[PDB]
Design a protein around this ligand. Structure first.
Ligand SMILES: [Mg+2]
Ligand SMILES: [Mg+2]
Lengths: 211, 240, 222, 231, 235, 233, 249, 244
């Protein structure tokens, strides 16, 4: 499960940590936010290699752009470099569903959903992965433009937790990022095992679960 | 494929085909550009050996590359079309992939790059063309004016002229253009531009074309009359 | 119809210590229910204090290791004999793997060494080149038998301090190379018992600041 | 003269002037010496700086663990030819699990250079090379000219004033060929041979470049403080 | 005529020798390597006072740790800069690290003898490539259209160069501070330039390990020019 | 992609104290039709190597020409072609392995399993396998096809691990190999009685034996076997 | 590899294309050939100037069938003509008959030959063809026609004309005798008279090559039973047929 | 190798001129004069054939005037064979445009394409330029009646009246004297023939040395008709304008 949303303080990006092959949990320490450069983030869903490879390639194209133009690349331009690239490969079997997230002077906080069948969508809230429907529920019912940074971060964390609980293929730990105009800020790794009990107690949620 | 190195160095370190390309530019009709405080004007000389010319349809000397940028030139007319087509294609390609129209500088850098490539590729000769490229960057109100030449060097100018007798009109601009106070209106700028061409033109008749470019894709060519009123008022202040 | 792939069995295991790393593999090579060899080495010293194993389809594994070795050679030629650091080797291998994205090397690759601060490092790759730095990774046939054990015995997962009843985790102490090697041998001894493709021999390559050492142990041959 | 405009034109006496002019670029190059015993082979090269602020241009290039060379003439051409040698050494190892014989390397270089002497639009290479190696038949030294002539030798020199070094090695032949199992003595004879080609300047610590390959010795290059011992 | 790849009777390539002549006509560029950084300075040489001189770009970033100054037919440098930037970025993509300054320089120089009858002629521009890497510290290279590159403690190229190089021969020592190097570049540029040196017709830049490559503001350079004037007036 | 048409069955081999032995029968089958009865599937390369090949015979004949062309080429401009710069078993193997993997990678394999047996310059035994997939491996005993299932178990009782090799004489190894060939003749429906055997010894060089036959066969006990359960007559 | 990718024909300072002028000079030296258009036919004719008397000059065909209703003759370089005839026969099929299922009209086949000749005048590394052609033909909608094609690729329709050696004299001779009421036999008679002037030696059926475009020849079709197919209009006259008309001279 | 024999057809002279373009223009100055005149109600094309003969089949002959489509014609001055290469290309571009947009190609778009083709031969390929200047007469519903010329440089310009070929200096002076904006096609016809009459190097101007065409909306109702005059019709208009 991966999500990103826009609010008054920028962008929150939150992801789980689990990779599976069939029922086998291959890893609980996967890094699903790829740090494109200090101002741009992308999220990993679909093929792990396709996301890693092409989004670090995107970082290279972004760097060349700003060397040539002496200006920060827009999120619009950066996201389109990726979508145009994967569109060239359409039909060959790339698998990718990603949110390209940034915050520039001209655009403000901006998120593009980009996908291996060539879709490129600008929006305020996206949620991608096997647990996406669980995350959306929490997001949709608590989201406001005017969340504080602190409450926005919690909401992103709480939404991934919801997904990790119910979705068999989501879990391990939650990674949080806050994207500001001056760059993204990492807000740590949160083991879901410990986080679940802590949230259940402090919030009184998950009464269905015995603790 | 025909591969011959036509642009090569001479013993004194000169590339004569590029230098001869500039000689073609010197022979072309004069072109001038002047930036005001909130506009840029492009003026072009029309050689008057051609009456019976149909001016509705005859290729105009200033060309829109996009809705916010224009290009004029001196030199081989046929050569200029090739650069204008390439620049227009690149302007649309930039909009398509970056989702923003070209900056005036980006567009200049592109055209200049095409000109340079034609000075060190086998089987081709350099463009016999220098250009003036003017406009406003998207969502920007600061005026832009650049110049390119056959070698592919380019640079930014407060005001500049190219083509035949441009030595003279540059003379005029260097003594009459004050950087600390650019022509603060369209009027002042257009008047300074028509004055600069009158140093060199002949009749201020349909010898002079003027195009004004303002911010936000506001581009308009003045007509014979409106220029004529500039020509008129200019000589009436003269006899004094 | 021609099938360009095969499965040669094998199980590999990489563990990163504080100032060392080990990469271990069994030495049995199989197809179907037959043993091709009881000693076919599958973990390799690649130079610059890097060890590598590409487990799965052995033809692809051999081709990849060979290519990487060659890439080390040309890195030296092209960059004034600069030492190829483990993070740089890892990125390089991603590009070797992803270059065959649409006809993959059918292998699970692990490399081990030391990072640029002298700390133990292990990197793990999927067949098309996604990778990550890890502390602990088993690959191949018996990976699913081995990982849960390492989670429990290396990372102390699900272990708490006696008396606190679940309130205080067992604290994560650093293991010596002798300790790590005990866990490797027990991992493979156990895997040998329950997995038909695991057996014959265990070869361990150990990487420290002093270089690469080897150890060999017999495993059951049935 | 009327026959020196390109490499595809014989003169009326059967000469190839573009090739002879390429040979002339080697003659302007800084001196480099090669010699061998039955256990080792050595390269010594006098490096040239541009001025007092500048580095001394490297002359020795490793081709494989068992093979390498030194250059005199156009350095970018040495880079092209040594790169080709690296690839051919590499190909032999990867495909045949076999170290490329020094003699075979010489044949490959000859043929690569030859093609640039018989076709329109090419130019000959403007560099000479001394190739040393240790392979299954022992220590070897080769001299390459961009005419494509490659010759196996006990010792030689190329570059400006190489004639002095070369005469020295010709007298010493019976001594240095026997310096088996003593790398340092072989290098000394090399540094002595190259000294017969100095004038005005002498061998300094940023001036001198030495390489050696042999029985249990990977091709290795010594520069800087590692040559003080021999200065 | 004669081939573009012809050797002269002295064993030199005519076209390379002739491009060296075009480079002698170029505006001056100077670099000085110190243990605190490498400085790069250029003469802008605007052809008219109506030319906006901050549009003159003869110092150029290749990567954060590598800068470049040019002299000669400067339009020729653009594809060389493009290649250098691509090579630096590509190396980082493949190896997750900074490329060495020398490797970058060698890669640019591989372009140079690729002309024939590939491009139709040698480049008519020379480059000073300055930067820092962990293995060899601060470095300055001179890249020529012959494909040769030399490392230098200090170097001048363009029309004022052998006057400037004589100067650099005298003033460079292994303990120069960054500040001293800056003043030195300014002073030697002032010496060999036709016009009077000021902040609009010369430009400075440096590369430090900490802050990477930086082109100096005109205000910053104006201050250093002032400071130079006063130290000269003080003996 | 193709399919094998005319095929050769097992190749079997092992190391012993001073060298290697390799053997293969002389049949080329056409499905279940035993079509061709004098096919040589051991191909000597020089005096130090024997390459044994199973699988598709048209591809075997192609590989045989590649090997012959390898010898021709190695001799070119090579004064030491019959001495220090002769082809080694290891060069011949690496070359074949490169070709096999390349062909598989182009989805157009040479449909074979190959064992290269020989002795290196330094006297070391060489024994290594490669097949249509480019898979390679070494063992003190190697066998292809049915031989892998029936010969290896027998040969491994003689040399079960590396340390058994110096204890194994050429007489013990050859007898083991010859017995395995009898067993394959009993149990492999695509085998023949006639085979070739080659010994590459570091002292006595290459001994190549043709027209060997399986002998000492037990069939007499068959006279007592009646019906399939209850029949007595 | 042909490395002559540049034009060998170029403009001189006076505006001349030298190689075309020189091709025209080669044509000027060539043996005379002519054509005359009648109301119901066209005749083309030339001299078979045999190179030795051991040569069998009926094996050298100067007058060539291009299509069943189109024929050609030349003056200038024989080998250039022979290859142009091969290309013209082919292009009649590839760029017309394989598309429209019928043979091209004379003017368009001329157009195609002309284009081939133009390209030898501008393409890289070739010289112009050293021939002028006279092409006679018939087609349904344009009737009878006669064209000249020159080394430049220029072509013009004629009532009657001559090319090669004696062309200035032959053209004056033809201007006197040509009118718009000639019947094919009249034009043949005039052709023979005209051609006699430029011929030195022997003048008979074996030294003259003459062909006509006239009526359909069902006897030369080779098959019967398709009413609309009536036979080729091109016909080469025999040695005997020429001699019969030489008594009537 | 082959370099030795290369004229280098695409180089500047030291004055910044294109040798081959200049020399092609010199060639064109010996071609029969062609004239185009644009009126309010149509366009006239008039051209002189190069010295004829009495045996030339005139009524099947075309050397100056060609149809590009139903709305656009050209007059040729220079190498006829070169012209036909370009003419066939222009005919194809016009049909390509009609196929793509389902609208007849605007006159200038056609003219620009042909001119770009000529330009290419002056900059790359090492081939000689086309020895041809065109006058284009055509109509489209954007600009109405239009006249253009192009020459071997690939430069083109628009005109109310223009000449190409021989004696253009004299012709142009005469056109400039008598041309007036409100002039009609029948007046333009007379001006064109009078001008050829005076500038010809022939002794007199007769029908057999002319080609003639008009483009008129003298086709019934909002539509345009091209008329390539037959020899008899040229003979009549010579008498009617009183030149014979
Ligand atoms: Mg893209
Ligand atoms: Mg078992």
């Amino acid at each position: 499960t991966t999500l990103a949303f826009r609010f008054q303080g920028g962008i929150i990006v939150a992801v789980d940590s689990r990779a599976t092959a069939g029922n086998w949990v291959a890893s609980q320490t996967v890094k699903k936010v790829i740090e494109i450069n200090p101002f741009l983030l992308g999220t990993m869903a679909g093929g792990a290699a396709d996301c890693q490879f092409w989004e670090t390639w995107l970082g290279s194209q972004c760097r060349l752009h700003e060397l040539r133009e002496k200006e920060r690349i827009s999120v619009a331009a950066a996201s389109k470099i990726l979508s145009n690239l994967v569109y060239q490969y359409k039909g060959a079997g790339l698998s990718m569903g990603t949110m390209i997230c940034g915050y520039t002077r001209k655009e403000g906080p901006t998120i593009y959903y980009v996908d291996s069948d060539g879709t490129r969508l600008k929006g305020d809230i996206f949620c991608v992965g096997s647990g996406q429907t669980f995350a959306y529920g929490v997001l949709d019912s608590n989201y406001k433009w005017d969340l504080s940074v602190e409450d926005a971060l919690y909401l992103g964390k709480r939404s991934i937790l919801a997904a990790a609980h119910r979705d068999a293929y989501s879990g391990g730990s939650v990674n949080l990022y806050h994207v500001t105009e001056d760059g993204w800020i990492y807000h740590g790794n949160h083991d879901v095992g410990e986080l679940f009990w802590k949230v259940k107690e402090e919030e009184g949620s998950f009464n269905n679960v015995i603790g | 494929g025909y591969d011959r190195a036509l642009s090569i160095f001479s013993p004194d370190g000169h590339i004569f085909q590029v230098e001869y390309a500039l000689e073609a530019v010197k022979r072309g009709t004069c072109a001038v550009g002047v930036k005001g405080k909130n506009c840029v004007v492009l003026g072009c000389e029309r050689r008057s050996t051609l009456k019976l010319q149909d001016t509705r349809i005859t290729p105009s000397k200033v060309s829109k590359i996009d809705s916010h940028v224009v290009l004029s030139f001196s030199g081989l007319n046929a050569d200029s079309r090739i650069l204008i087509e390439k620049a227009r294609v690149e302007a649309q390609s930039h909009r398509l992939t970056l989702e923003d129209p070209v900056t005036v500088e980006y567009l200049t850098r592109y055209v200049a790059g095409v000109q340079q490539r034609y000075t060190q590729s086998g089987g081709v000769r350099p463009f016999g063309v220098s250009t003036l490229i003017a406009g406003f960057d998207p969502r920007d109100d600061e005026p832009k004016l650049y110049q390119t030449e056959p070698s592919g060097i380019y640079s930014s100018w407060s005001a500049q002229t190219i083509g035949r007798n441009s030595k003279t009109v540059r003379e005029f601009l260097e003594k009459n253009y004050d950087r600390k106070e650019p022509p603060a209106t369209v009027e002042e700028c257009v008047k300074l531009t028509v004055r600069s061409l009158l140093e060199v033109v002949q009749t201020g008749a349909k010898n002079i074309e003027i195009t004004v470019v303002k911010p936000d894709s506001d581009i308009v060519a003045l007509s014979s009359e409106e220029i004529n009123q500039y020509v008129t008022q200019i000589e009436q202040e003269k006899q004094e | 119809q021609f099938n360009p792939y095969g499965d040669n069995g094998g199980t590999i295991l990489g563990i990163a210590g504080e100032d060392f790393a080990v990469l271990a593999g069994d030495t049995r090579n199989i197809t179907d229910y037959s043993i091709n060899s009881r000693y076919e080495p599958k973990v390799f010293d690649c130079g610059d204090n890097i060890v590598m194993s590409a487990n799965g389809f052995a033809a692809d594994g051999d081709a990849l290791v060979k290519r990487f070795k060659n890439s080390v050679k040309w890195y030296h030629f092209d960059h004034n004999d600069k030492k190829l650091s483990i993070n740089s080797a890892a990125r390089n291998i991603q590009h070797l793997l992803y270059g065959k994205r649409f006809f993959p090397y059918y292998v699970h690759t692990i490399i081990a060494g030391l990072d640029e601060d002298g700390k133990g490092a292990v990197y793990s790759f999927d067949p098309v080149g996604s990778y990550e730095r890890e502390q602990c990774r088993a690959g191949g046939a018996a990976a699913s038998l081995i990982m849960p054990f390492l989670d429990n015995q290396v990372n102390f997962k699900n272990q708490y301090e006696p008396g606190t009843n679940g309130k205080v985790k067992k604290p994560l102490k650093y293991l010596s190379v002798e300790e790590v090697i005990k866990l490797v041998r027990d991992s493979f001894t156990s895997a040998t018992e329950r997995h038909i493709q695991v057996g014959d021999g265990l070869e361990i390559l150990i990487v420290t600041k002093d270089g690469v050492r080897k150890e060999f142990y017999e495993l059951k041959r049935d | 003269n009327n026959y020196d405009g390109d490499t595809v034109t014989f003169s009326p006496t059967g000469r190839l002037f573009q090739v002879e002019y390429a040979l002339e670029a080697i003659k302007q190059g800084s001196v480099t010496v090669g010699l061998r015993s039955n256990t080792h082979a050595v390269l010594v090269a006098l490096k040239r700086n541009a001025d007092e602020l500048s580095s001394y241009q490297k002359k020795i290039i490793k081709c494989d663990e068992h093979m390498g060379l030194s250059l005199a003439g156009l350095a970018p051409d040495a880079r092209v030819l040594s790169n080709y040698l690296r690839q051919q050494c590499n190909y032999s190892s990867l495909v045949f699990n076999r170290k490329l014989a020094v003699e075979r390397a010489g044949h490959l270089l000859c043929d690569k250079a030859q093609k640039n002497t018989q076709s329109y639009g090419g130019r000959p290479y403007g560099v000479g090379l001394l190739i040393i190696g240790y392979d299954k038949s022992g220590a070897h030294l080769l001299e390459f000219q961009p005419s494509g002539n490659v010759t196996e030798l006990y010792g030689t020199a190329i570059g400006a004033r190489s004639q002095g070094a070369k005469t020295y090695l010709e007298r010493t032949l019976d001594t240095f060929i026997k310096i088996d199992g003593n790398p340092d003595e072989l290098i000394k004879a090399g540094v002595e041979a190259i000294s017969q080609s100095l004038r005005d300047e002498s061998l300094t610590v940023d001036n001198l470049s030495i390489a050696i390959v042999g029985k249990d010795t990977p091709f290795t290059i010594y520069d800087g403080e590692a040559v003080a011992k021999y200065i | 005529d004669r081939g573009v790849s012809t050797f002269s009777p002295e064993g030199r390539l005519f076209q390379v020798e002739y491009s060296l002549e075009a480079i002698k006509l170029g505006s001056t560029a100077i670099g000085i390597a110190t243990k605190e950084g490498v400085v790069l300075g250029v003469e802008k040489r605007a052809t008219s006072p109506l030319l906006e001189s901050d549009s003159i770009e003869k110092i150029v970033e290749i990567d954060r740790h590598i800068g470049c100054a040019m002299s000669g037919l400067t339009a020729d440098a653009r594809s060389m800069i493009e290649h250098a930037r691509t090579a630096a970025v590509t190396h980082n993509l493949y190896y997750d690290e900074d490329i060495n300054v020398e490797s970058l320089t060698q890669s640019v120089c591989d372009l140079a003898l690729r002309f024939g009858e590939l491009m139709s002629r040698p480049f008519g521009v020379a480059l000073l490539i300055a930067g820092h890497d962990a293995d060899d510290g601060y470095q300055l290279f001179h890249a020529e259209p012959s494909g040769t590159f030399y490392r230098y403690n200090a170097k001048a190229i363009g029309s004022g160069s052998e006057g400037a190089q004589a100067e650099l021969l005298n003033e460079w020592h292994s303990s120069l501070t960054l500040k001293e190097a800056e003043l030195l570049v300014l002073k030697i540029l002032k010496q060999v330039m036709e016009e009077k040196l000021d902040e609009n017709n010369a430009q400075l830049s440096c590369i430090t390990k900490q802050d990477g490559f930086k082109i100096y503001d005109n205000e910053k350079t104006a201050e250093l020019i002032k400071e130079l004037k006063e130290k000269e007036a003080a003996e | 992609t193709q399919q094998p048409i005319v095929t050769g069955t097992s190749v079997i081999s092992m190391k012993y104290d001073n060298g290697v032995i390799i053997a293969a029968d002389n049949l080329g089958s056409y499905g279940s039709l035993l079509r061709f009865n004098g096919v040589e599937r051991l191909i000597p390369v020089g005096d130090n190597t024997v390459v044994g090949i199973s699988g598709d015979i048209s591809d075997m004949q192609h590989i045989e020409r590649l090997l012959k062309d390898l010898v021709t080429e190695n001799a070119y401009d090579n004064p030491l072609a019959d001495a220090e710069e002769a082809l080694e078993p290891s060069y011949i193997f690496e070359y074949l392995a490169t070709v096999m993997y390349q062909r598989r990678s182009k989805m157009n394999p040479l449909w074979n399993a190959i064992i290269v047996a020989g002795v290196q310059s330094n006297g070391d035994q060489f024994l290594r396998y490669v097949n249509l997939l480019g898979v390679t491996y070494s063992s003190p005993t190697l066998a292809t096809g049915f031989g892998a299932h029936m010969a290896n178990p027998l040969l491994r009782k003689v040399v079960d691990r590396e340390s058994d090799i110096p204890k194994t004489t050429v007489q013990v190894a050859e007898e083991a190999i010859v017995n395995a060939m009898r067993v394959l003749y009993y149990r492999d429906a695509r085998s023949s009685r006639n085979f070739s055997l080659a010994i590459i010894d570091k002292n006595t060089g290459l001994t190549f034996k043709k027209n060997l036959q399986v002998e000492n066969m037990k069939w007499d006990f068959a006279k007592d076997i009646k019906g399939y359960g209850t029949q007595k007559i | 590899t042909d490395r002559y990718s540049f034009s060998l024909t170029t403009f001189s300072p006076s505006g001349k294309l030298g190689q075309i002028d020189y091709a025209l000079t080669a044509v000027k030296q060539g043996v005379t050939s002519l054509g005359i258009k009648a109301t119901n036919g066209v005749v083309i004719a030339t001299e078979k100037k045999s190179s030795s008397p051991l040569a069998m000059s009926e094996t050298l065909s100067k007058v060539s069938l291009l299509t069943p209703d189109i024929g050609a003759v030349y003056s200038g370089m024989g080998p250039d003509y022979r290859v142009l005839v091969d290309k013209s026969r082919k292009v009649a099929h590839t760029s017309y008959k394989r598309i429209y299922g019928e043979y091209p009209p004379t003017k368009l086949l001329v157009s195609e030959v002309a284009k081939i000749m133009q390209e030898a005048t501008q393409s890289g590394g070739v010289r112009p063809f050293g021939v002028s052609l006279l092409i006679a033909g018939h087609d349904e909608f344009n009737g009878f026609s006669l064209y000249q094609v020159d080394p430049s690729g220029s072509y013009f329709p004629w009532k009657a004309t001559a090319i090669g050696k004696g062309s200035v004299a032959a053209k004056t001779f033809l201007e006197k005798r040509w009118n718009d009421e000639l019947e094919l036999e009249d034009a043949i008679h005039i052709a023979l008279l005209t051609l006699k002037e430029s011929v030195e030696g022997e003048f008979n059926g074996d030294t003259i090559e003459l062909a006509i475009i006239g009526d359909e020849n069902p006897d030369l079709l080779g098959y019967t039973g398709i009413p609309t197919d009536k036979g080729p209009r091109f016909r080469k006259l025999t040695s005997q047929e020429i001699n019969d008309r030489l008594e009537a001279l | 190798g082959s370099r030795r024999y290369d004229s280098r057809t695409t180089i500047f002279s030291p004055e910044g001129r294109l040798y081959q373009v200049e020399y092609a223009l010199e060639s064109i100055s010996h071609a029969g004069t062609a004239i185009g005149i644009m009126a309010s109600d149509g366009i006239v094309l008039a051209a002189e054939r190069k010295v004829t003969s009495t045996l030339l089949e005139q009524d099947t002959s075309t050397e100056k005037l060609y149809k590009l489509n139903d709305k656009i014609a050209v007059a040729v001055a220079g190498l006829t064979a070169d012209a036909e290469i370009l003419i066939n290309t222009a005919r194809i571009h016009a049909q390509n445009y009609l196929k793509t947009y389902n609208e007849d190609i605007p006159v200038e778009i056609l003219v620009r394409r042909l001119s770009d083709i000529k330009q290419g031969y002056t900059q790359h390929g090492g081939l000689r330029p086309f020895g041809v200047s065109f006058i284009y007469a055509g109509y489209d519903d954007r600009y109405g009646y239009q006249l253009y010329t192009s020459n071997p440089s690939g430069n083109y310009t628009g005109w109310k009246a223009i000449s190409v070929g021989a004696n253009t200096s004299a012709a142009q002076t005469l056109l400039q004297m008598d041309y007036k904006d409100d002039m009609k096609v029948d007046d333009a016809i007379e001006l064109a023939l009078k001008t050829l009459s005076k500038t010809t190097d022939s002794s007199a101007l007769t029908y057999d040395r002319l080609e003639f065409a008009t483009i008129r909306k003298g086709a019934n109702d909002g539509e345009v008709y091209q008329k390539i005059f037959k020899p008899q019709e040229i003979k009549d208009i010579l008498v009617k304008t009183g030149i014979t």
